[PDB]
Ligand binder design. Structure first.
Ligand SMILES: [Mg+2]
Ligand SMILES: [Mg+2]
Ligand SMILES: [Mg+2]
Ligand SMILES: [Mg+2]
Ligand SMILES: [Mg+2]
Ligand SMILES: [Mg+2]
Ligand SMILES: [Mg+2]
Ligand SMILES: [Mg+2]
Ligand SMILES: [Mg+2]
Length: 146
RNA sequence: AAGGGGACCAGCCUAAACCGUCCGGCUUGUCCGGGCGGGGUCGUGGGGCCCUCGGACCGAAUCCCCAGCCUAGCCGAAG
């Protein structure tokens, strides 16, 4: 199924390009998240340089990504979690980590964009990349304590 | 089944192009979408749009009135 990419993508295409995908990919992942739209003839006519209106949005969020690459890149996130001095009783999730950063540093961050494969269960200092924009990574230190 | 002989007899309205108007969208306009109005209905192809020459008859399956008919009856020859 042909789609119009509203956002840049990795190893797939570029914003405004018409690409071919399996229908399950488009209807269950790409379209519901806004990453693409159906390449219907109405949309194709409606593509009134929609890339230009989409290249601006990507540039708009690329102003804050670098801007937040200073306030949110000059801090260590310290969160105290109940533990037996070695192992956390519960865990720290991306929402919990984002809650700490928005309540101990006053900067909102999308918990989904954090690159955290599995929640943290062991006390220690952790580093992960916050990636709100392609080619603009933001490494962030995390500290969890008793 | 076609064909032949008879009964009966009648053909119409829409979608789409294009034009207007109201409402919604934000990917804010020659934009898309949803109502409604106009326009259009065909096989000898037809229609839309542009240019030219053009420019009263037919008539309901709808409505109105009347005839007739139905639901009680009456007159009716001569031991
Ligand atoms: Mg016959
Ligand atoms: Mg009509
Ligand atoms: Mg149609
Ligand atoms: Mg309309
Ligand atoms: Mg109409
Ligand atoms: Mg024709
Ligand atoms: Mg009698
Ligand atoms: Mg009598
Ligand atoms: Mg008698």
């Amino acid at each position: 199924m042909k789609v119009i990419l509203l956002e840049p993508l990795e190893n797939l295409g570029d914003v405004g390009q018409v690409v071919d995908v399996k229908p399950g990919y488009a209807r269950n992942y790409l379209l519901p998240r806004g990453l693409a739209v159906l390449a219907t003839e109405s949309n194709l006519k409606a593509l009134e340089a929609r890339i230009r209106a989409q290249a601006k949005r990507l540039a708009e969020r690329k102003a804050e990504a670098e801007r937040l690459k200073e306030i949110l890149e000059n801090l260590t996130l310290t969160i105290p979690v109940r533990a037996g001095e070695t192992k956390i009783y519960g865990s720290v999730t991306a929402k919990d980590i984002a809650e700490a950063l928005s309540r101990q540093h006053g900067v909102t961050i999308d918990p989904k964009r954090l690159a955290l494969e599995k929640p943290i269960k062991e006390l220690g200092e952790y580093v992960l990349t916050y990636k709100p924009h392609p080619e603009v990574p933001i490494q962030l230190k995390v500290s969890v304590v008793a």
